Every structure is written in structure tokens, then in C-alpha cells.
Design a protein around this ligand. Structure first.
Ligand SMILES: [Zn+2]
Length: 256
DNA sequence: GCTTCATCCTG
DNA sequence: CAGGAGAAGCC
């Protein structure tokens, strides 16, 4: 679940309960139980995302921070209904007609304003690829800054301190799109390559967000999990190798 | 960057 | 039933 999936989730959560008075609130964690009575009657004002971090803001200035990491998942159901699953329920925010449920996630914390501005993660993450204000220009600027210009892409594209929201599938799909291997550094690219990379870093995540689900051609994986299969661009056989602690899918025939 | 955490999926 | 699929740890 990378930036695009998380924003899609957040949009569904907002459509479900944004602005509606909470009729019941439940948290699995003992440390969060105290907030149950405090939030009943309040309402979610908006669901903000920063990369894969999701922030559910409430009308009393509290904010529930949740990060699904590799296994958390939200579900929208009609109030009263309980999904058929073996997953562990961690949060229930219920309104008159709709209820949202967070399953499996382990990183869940209730934040006060002071904790928001200085949260370790929220404080170290870089600009969000889904942020409309972020442009290819600013992205190029970032890639060439002394801070990132010498970083190999294999690790850079997974680092949320560079651009928030990029995960392993976006990492491999972006690099394949621009024909680059994971060992490249922004400082060694020619102007044409840097431009393509800069645009792809924003356009692919935004394309997945807009079309992988919901919609309104369609996003699809070109190399992610297609190792052993022929590249649709050059026909070479896609390979898989571990780079920066995550499986790197790439085509030796058109990625250089 | 390497290892550990943490939950569900998979060979 | 290992260990594969995004952090925090360890600072
Ligand atoms: Zn190819």
C-alpha cells in the first residue's frame, strides 16, 4: 500500500464519515481507550495524508495518526455490520449510517497539535508526490541538490525523506518508464533523462491514484512482479534482484 | 544501509 | 510453517 492506495483509502474514509457526528468510537489499544468517550459526539473534519501516513483530524483538535506499513487496511461498512475476516480490528469510528474500520495496523497514535508539528515521521518526510503544489521543476531541483544528487536511485526512491509516497512498485515502475537502472545518481544524468525522471516521479504515482482504482488508458504494471516475463517495450526477459532491501524488478534490455 | 518489528499472505 | 511483502530501531 503506497501513496496512491493510501490517498484512495483516505478519500473513501472522508466520503463515508467526514462531518458526521460520531455515535461510537473504539480502539483496541489500551493506551487509546481514554479517547473513546472524548470523541463520541465529535466529527472527523478531514483525512490528511502525507505519503503513506494517514491523519484523521477531529473537531476537537485531536488527530489519529495511522501508518499501515505492510499490512494495515481500512474498510468502509454500513453501521452495525461486521466484516467477515480473521484480521485484528484496531479502530472503529462509527456514525449514524457509515462506519470505518482499521484492521491490522500497529502504528496508531493519538496526537495533540504539539505532537503533530514535531512527529518524528511527519517531521522527516519530504514533499508528497500527490501534492498538487509539487511540480516537476521543484522535483528536478530536489534531485540535483547536494543532499540528493549523489544518492543511487534504488535507495533514493524508497526514502520518504526524498519524496513521500513512493514505495517499491512505484520505484520499479518509475525507473523502467524512464529507462534507468537503480545504480544511477541524479548528478550523472543528462538533461533529457533528468527531465523524464522528474516528470515520472510525479505522473506515475498520480496516474495510479487516478486510475488503478475508482477511475475518473488505465494504470498497469510494466515490470512489478513480472520477472521471468518478456518486456513489452523491448522483449527482453524481466529480472528480479534485491536492491536496497527490496526486490528490484527491471529489464536489462531497456534499462541502462 | 543492516536488522528488528509486526501482521497477513504464500510456497 | 518458515520467510516474503514499510517502517522504526539503534541512534
Ligand atoms: Zn525492456
Amino acid at each position: 500500500p503506497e501513496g496512491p492506495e493510501i490517498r484512495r483509502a483516505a478519500d473513501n474514509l472522508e466520503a463515508a464519515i467526514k462531518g458526521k457526528p460520531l455515535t461510537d468510537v473504539w480502539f483496541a489499544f489500551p493506551q487509546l481507550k481514554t479517547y473513546q468517550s472524548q470523541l463520541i459526539g465529535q466529527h472527523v473534519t478531514h483525512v490528511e495524508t502525507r505519503g503513506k501516513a494517514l491523519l484523521t483530524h477531529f473537531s476537537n483538535d485531536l488527530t489519529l495518526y495511522s501508518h499501515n506499513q505492510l499490512y494495515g487496511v481500512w474498510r468502509v461498512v454500513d453501521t452495525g455490520e461486521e466484516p467477515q475476516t480473521t484480521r485484528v480490528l484496531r479502530v472503529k469510528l462509527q456514525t449514524a449510517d457509515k462506519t470505518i474500520l482499521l484492521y491490522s495496523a500497529s502504528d496508531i497514535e493519538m496526537l495533540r497539535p504539539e505532537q503533530l508539528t514535531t512527529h518524528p515521521f511527519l517531521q522527516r518526510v519530504g514533499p508528497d508526490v500527490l501534492d498538487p503544489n509539487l511540480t516537476p521543476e521543484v522535483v528536478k531541483e530536489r534531485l540535483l541538490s547536494p543532499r540528493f544528487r549523489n544518492r543511487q536511485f534504488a535507495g533514493l526512491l524508497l526514502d520518504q525523506a526524498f519524496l513521500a509516497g513512493l514505495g517499491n512498485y512505484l520505484r520499479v515502475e518509475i525507473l523502467w518508464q524512464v529507462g534507468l537502472t537503480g545504480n544511477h545518481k541524479a548528478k550523472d544524468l543528462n538533461a533529457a533523462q533528468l527531465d523524464a525522471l522528474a516528470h515520472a516521479l510525479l505522473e506515475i504515482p498520480r496516474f495510479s491514484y487516478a486510475t488503478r482504482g475508482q477511475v475518473d488508458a488505465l494504470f498497469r504494471f510494466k515490470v512489478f512482479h513480472r520477472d521471468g516475463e518478456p518486456c513489452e517495450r523491448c522483449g527482453s526477459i524481466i529480472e528480479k534482484t534485491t536492491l536496497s532491501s527490496a526486490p528490484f524488478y527491471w529489464c536489462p534490455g531497456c534499462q541502462h
